Amino acid sequence: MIDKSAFVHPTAIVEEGASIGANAHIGPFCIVGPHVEIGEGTVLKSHVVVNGHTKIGRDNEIYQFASIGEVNQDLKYAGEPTRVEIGDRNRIRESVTIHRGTVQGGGLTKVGSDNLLMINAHIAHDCTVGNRCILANNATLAGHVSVDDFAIIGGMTAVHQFCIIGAHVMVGGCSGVAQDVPPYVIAQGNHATPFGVNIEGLKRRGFSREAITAIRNAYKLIYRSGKTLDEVKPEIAELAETYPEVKAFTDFFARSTRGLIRH
Amino acid sequence: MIDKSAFVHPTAIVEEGASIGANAHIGPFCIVGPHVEIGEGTVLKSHVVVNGHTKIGRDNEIYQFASIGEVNQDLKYAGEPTRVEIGDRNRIRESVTIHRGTVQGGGLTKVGSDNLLMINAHIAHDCTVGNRCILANNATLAGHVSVDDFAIIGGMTAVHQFCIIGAHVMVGGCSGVAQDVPPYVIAQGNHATPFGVNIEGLKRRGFSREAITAIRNAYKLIYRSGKTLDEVKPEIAELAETYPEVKAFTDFFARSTRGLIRH
Amino acid sequence: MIDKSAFVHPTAIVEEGASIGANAHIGPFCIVGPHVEIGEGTVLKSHVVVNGHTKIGRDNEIYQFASIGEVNQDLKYAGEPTRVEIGDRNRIRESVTIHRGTVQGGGLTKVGSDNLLMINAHIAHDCTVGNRCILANNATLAGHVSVDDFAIIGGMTAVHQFCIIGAHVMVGGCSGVAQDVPPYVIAQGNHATPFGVNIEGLKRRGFSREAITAIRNAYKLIYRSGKTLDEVKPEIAELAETYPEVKAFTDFFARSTRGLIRH
Numbered sequence A, B, C: 001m002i003d004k005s006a007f008v009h010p011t012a013i014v015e016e017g018a019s020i021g022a023n024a025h026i027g028p029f030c031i032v033g034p035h036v037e038i039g040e041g042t043v044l045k046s047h048v049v050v051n052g053h054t055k056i057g058r059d060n061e062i063y064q065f066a067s068i069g070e071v072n073q074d075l076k077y078a079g080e081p082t083r084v085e086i087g088d089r090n091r092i093r094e095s096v097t098i099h100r101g102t103v104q105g106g107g108l109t110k111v112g113s114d115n116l117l118m119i120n121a122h123i124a125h126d127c128t129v130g131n132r133c134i135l136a137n138n139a140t141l142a143g144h145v146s147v148d149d150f151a152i153i154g155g156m157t158a159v160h161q162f163c164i165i166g167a168h169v170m171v172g173g174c175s176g177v178a179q180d181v182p183p184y185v186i187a188q189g190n191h192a193t194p195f196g197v198n199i200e201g202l203k204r205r206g207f208s209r210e211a212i213t214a215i216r217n218a219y220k221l222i223y224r225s226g227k228t229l230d231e232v233k234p235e236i237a238e239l240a241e242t243y244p245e246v247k248a249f250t251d252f253f254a255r256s257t258r259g260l261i262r263h
C-alpha cells in the first residue's frame, strides 16, 4: 500500500504489493519490488533499485545508483527468499550495495539507524551493522561481518568474512581486516593490527575519564601483559565489576570466532 | 533482430540493429546499442548500458549500473570500432565495467563463460578473462591483462597492465599485482608475492594427488631451487613429460612478458 | 535556458532554470537540476545526475552513473547552497562522483580542464583539481585535497583530507597518501613515500635538461641533504633564481599544511 502522502515519481516503477509510508519520496527511475517496505519520510533520490524482502525504516536518504535488497554474491545462494532490514535516519550514498542474506547464514542482512554509508560501500549477505557507524568510500564487508555500534571503517578498507568490528572501533583507510577487532580499538594496516584505544572517539561520546582509563587498562591486559586471552578474560571481567563499559570486551569475546587482530 | 520471445521493457531503449535472442530479458531503463548481440536467456536486470561492437552469450545475468562495451580509458584510443566478446552463464554484478579493445592492443576485450564479476570489477580494454574466474568487489584490471581459467582475484586488488594471472591462481584481497603470476600459485601483497601452490583449489577441482605433487615440485623448481628461470624451464618441461598438468607452466612462460612475481 | 541546438533526450529531466549550451547533448534518463549550467558541446551520455549550483564547461564527456554537484559526505554540511565548477574537455567516466563544497571549507569544489577521471574516482567537497590530471579507477580524495596541474593518481589510491598532490606528481596505485607531495615527485606506498623525480613525465612535457637537473637538485636538498625544511627553503629559492621551474617548490611550501611525505 502506497500512502496517500507519499510521492512516487511517474517514471519510477513501484510494483504492486510494495508498502510506501507517509511523506516518503520515490524519485525518477527508481525500481521498488513487491516485497519492499519503505518507512515514513524516507527518500530514494533517483535511479535506486530496492528489491527482495526488504524493510527500510523512516527518514532514510538513499542516493542514486544504490542497490538495496539485491541477490547476494555468495555462490552458495540459490534464490531463497531471504531478507534485509534497514533502520532509521541512515544516509546511504551513491552506488552503495546492501545484499540480502543466505539461508546458511541466518537469512538476514541488518543495518541499524543513524549510519553513514559512503559511496560504493558494500554490505554483504548476513552482515549486521549497528547504529551510528560510518563506512567510508569503497569500504567493503565480506559476508557475515558484524560492524558494532559507533564503529567507523576508513576508505578503501575491506573486511574478511565473519570478522567482528567491535563497538567504537576506528579502522584506518587502505586497510585489510582479517581477524576480529575488540571494542574501543584503533586498527590499521594490511593486515590490520591494533594501535591503542580510540580515546578521542570515546571522549566525544561522553565516556568518563574513569571509563576510558579502565578501557585502556583492559587493552593493556589483552595486548601488553603478555598473558593469553584465556588468562585475561577473568581479569577483564573483574575490572568490569567496577567499570561497566569494560563488559563490552566480555560480550565481544563471546561472539569472536576468528581470534583478535594482533601486532 | 529482436526474437519474438525476448522481453524488452517499454522504458528500455534498444537501437535498431541490435540482436536480442530467444527468452532474453531487457529490463527497465537499459540502453542497448545497434551493434550489440545478446544471446538466448541473457538478462539485463535494469539500468544497464551495453554499446559498441559487443557480443554477449547465453544465460548471462547482468546487474544494474553495469557498463558493457563502453569506450575504454586508454588515452591512445580514438574511437575506432573495436570489440567486446562475453561468453555464457556469467554473473556480472552491479557497476561492473567491461571496456572495448584498442586497435593497438588487438581490438578485442574477451570474457569467457561461468565467471563471477563482483560489484565494480573492471575489465579494461584488450583484457582476456577465461572461464570460471572470480573477480571480487573492486578488483581492477589495467589494459591487456590476462586472467586465465579458474583464477580468482580478491577484493580491492588491482593488476598492472599486460600482467598474466595464471590458471587456478588465487590472488588475495588488498593486493597489487605488478608482474606475472604462474599457474596454480597463491599470491598476496603490495606488490604481490608468491605464497605456495593453491592446493585446496586444485583438490576441489579434481586434480589428482600425483598432479598436485608434481605442481608443487615445479613450484619449488621456480622459487626454491635457487636456479634461474632459464635453467628451470627444461626441468619443468621434463616433469611435464610425466604429469601433463605441469605443461601449464610451459605454456605460461611462453606468454609471460613482465617476469614472475617473486619473494 | 536550453539552447535551440542542444539535444535533450525525451526521457531526460532538465529542470526549469538549467542552462544548456549550444550543441550539448543530454542523454536518456539524465537528471539536471535548476542551478546547473552545461557548456557548449558537453555530452552527458545517459543515467547522469547533475544538481546543485554547478557550472560545467565545454566539450566535456560525462559517462553513465556519474553524480556531479551532489551533496557532499561531510557530516558538518547542512544543506547550504555551495558550488561545483568544472572546466573544459574533461573525460568523466562511469560512476565518478564530484561533490559540492562546504561553507566551512570555502564553498567550492573545483575541477579544471583536460582531466581524465576514471571509473568511480571521487572528488570530495572543497577539493581543487587542476588541469591535465589523471585519477585512475577508484582514486579517492577526501575533502579539501588539492591535485595540482598534470598530477596523476594511480588506481585504488586514496588521499587524506587537506593533502596537496603537487604539480607533475605521480602517485602509484594501491597507495595511501597522508601528507603533502611536493611538485615533480613520484610517490608510492601505504603510507606513500617519495621515490625520486618524475623525470619521464617532465621529459614528455617539454621540460629542458637543465630544468630537470635543477628539479632533481631541489629534490636532493629536500630529501638527501639531511637539512631541515626551514634550512632548504632559501636554498631552493636561490636555485629558482636561475631555474624558474624550481619556484614550484616555493609556491607549494607556502600552501603545504600537513608536512611532506618522507622516507
Ligand SMILES: CCCCCCCCCCC[C@@H](O)CC(=O)O[C@H]1[C@H](O)[C@@H](CO)O[C@H](OP(=O)(O)OP(=O)(O)OC[C@H]2O[C@@H](n3ccc(=O)[nH]c3=O)[C@H](O)[C@@H]2O)[C@@H]1NC(C)=O
Pocket: A072, A073, A074, A075, A076, A099, A122, A123, A124, A125, A140, A141, A142, A143, A144, A158, A159, A160, A161, A176, A177, A178, A191, B134, B136, B137, B152, B154, B155, B156, B169, B170, B173, B174, B198, B199, B200, B201, B202, B204
Ligand atoms: C585482507 C582482507 C581482504 C577481504 C576482502 C573481502 C572482499 C569481499 C567482497 C564482497 C563479497 C561478498 O558480497 C560475498 C561473499 O563474501 O561471499 C562469500 C561468503 O561470505 C563465504 C562465507 O559464507 O563463502 C564464500 O567464500 P569462501 O571463500 O568461503 O568460498 P568457497 O570456499 O566456495 O571458495 C570460493 C572459490 O575459491 C576457491 N578456493 C577456495 C579456497 C582455496 O584455498 N583456494 C581456492 O581456489 C574455490 O575453488 C572457489 O572457486 C563466498 N564467496 C563466494 C565467491 O561464493
Ligand SMILES: CCCCCCCCCCC[C@@H](O)CC(=O)O[C@H]1[C@H](O)[C@@H](CO)O[C@H](OP(=O)(O)OP(=O)(O)OC[C@H]2O[C@@H](n3ccc(=O)[nH]c3=O)[C@H](O)[C@@H]2O)[C@@H]1NC(C)=O
Pocket: B072, B073, B074, B075, B076, B099, B122, B123, B124, B125, B140, B141, B142, B143, B144, B158, B159, B160, B161, B176, B177, B178, B191, C134, C136, C137, C152, C154, C155, C156, C169, C170, C173, C174, C198, C199, C200, C201, C202, C204
Ligand atoms: C600496484 C599495481 C596497481 C595497478 C593499478 C591499475 C589500475 C588500472 C585502472 C584501469 C585503467 C584501464 O581501464 C585503462 C588503462 O590501463 O590504460 C593504459 C593502457 O593499458 C596502457 C597500455 O596500453 O597505456 C596507458 O598507460 P601508460 O602508463 O603506458 O600510459 P602513458 O605512457 O601514455 O602515460 C600516461 C600518463 O602518465 C604520465 N607519465 C608516464 C610515465 C612516467 O614515468 N611519468 C608520468 O608522469 C604521462 O605523462 C601520461 O600523462 C593507458 N593509460 C592511459 C591513462 O592512457
Ligand SMILES: CCCCCCCCCCC[C@@H](O)CC(=O)O[C@H]1[C@H](O)[C@@H](CO)O[C@H](OP(=O)(O)OP(=O)(O)OC[C@H]2O[C@@H](n3ccc(=O)[nH]c3=O)[C@H](O)[C@@H]2O)[C@@H]1NC(C)=O
Pocket: A134, A136, A137, A152, A154, A155, A156, A169, A170, A173, A174, A198, A199, A200, A201, A202, A204, C072, C073, C074, C075, C076, C099, C122, C123, C124, C125, C140, C141, C142, C143, C144, C158, C159, C160, C161, C176, C177, C178, C191
Ligand atoms: C591512508 C589515507 C587514507 C585516506 C582515505 C580517504 C577516504 C575519503 C573518502 C571520501 C570522504 C569525503 O567525501 C568526505 C570527507 O572527507 O569528509 C570529512 C571532511 O573532509 C573532514 C574535514 O573537513 O571532516 C570530517 O572528517 P574528520 O575525521 O575530521 O571528522 P570528525 O572529526 O567529525 O570525525 C568523524 C567521526 O570520527 C570519529 N572519530 C574521530 C577521531 C578519532 O580519533 N576517533 C573517532 O572515532 C568521530 O567520533 C566522528 O564520529 C569529514 N568526515 C565526516 C565523516 O564527516
Ligand SMILES: Cc1ccnc(-c2cc(C(=O)N3CCOC[C@H]3Cc3ccccc3F)[nH]n2)c1
Pocket: A134, A135, A136, A137, A152, A153, A154, A155, A170, A171, A172, A173, A174, A188, C142, C160, C161, C178
Ligand atoms: C593517517 C591515516 C591512516 C589511516 N586512515 C586514514 C584515513 C581514513 C580516512 C577516512 O576514510 N575518512 C572518511 C572521510 O572522513 C574523513 C575520514 C574519517 C575516518 C577516519 C578513519 C576511519 C573511518 C573514517 F570515516 N581518512 N584518513 C588516515
Ligand SMILES: Cc1ccnc(-c2cc(C(=O)N3CCOC[C@H]3Cc3ccccc3F)[nH]n2)c1
Pocket: A142, A160, A161, A178, B134, B135, B136, B137, B152, B153, B154, B155, B170, B171, B172, B173, B174, B188
Ligand atoms: C587473509 C586474507 C588475505 C588476503 N585476502 C583475503 C580475502 C580475499 C577475499 C575475497 O575477496 N573473497 C571474495 C568473497 O568471497 C570470499 C573471498 C573469496 C576469495 C578469496 C581470495 C581471492 C578471491 C576470492 F574471491 N576474502 N578474504 C584474506
Ligand SMILES: Cc1ccnc(-c2cc(C(=O)N3CCOC[C@H]3Cc3ccccc3F)[nH]n2)c1
Pocket: B142, B160, B161, B178, C134, C135, C136, C137, C152, C153, C154, C155, C170, C171, C172, C173, C174, C188
Ligand atoms: C609497479 C607499480 C607501482 C604502483 N602503481 C603502479 C600502477 C598504477 C597504475 C595506474 O593506475 N594506471 C592507470 C591506467 O593507466 C595505466 C596507469 C597509469 C598511471 C600510473 C601511475 C599513476 C597514475 C596513472 F594513471 N598502473 N600501474 C605500478
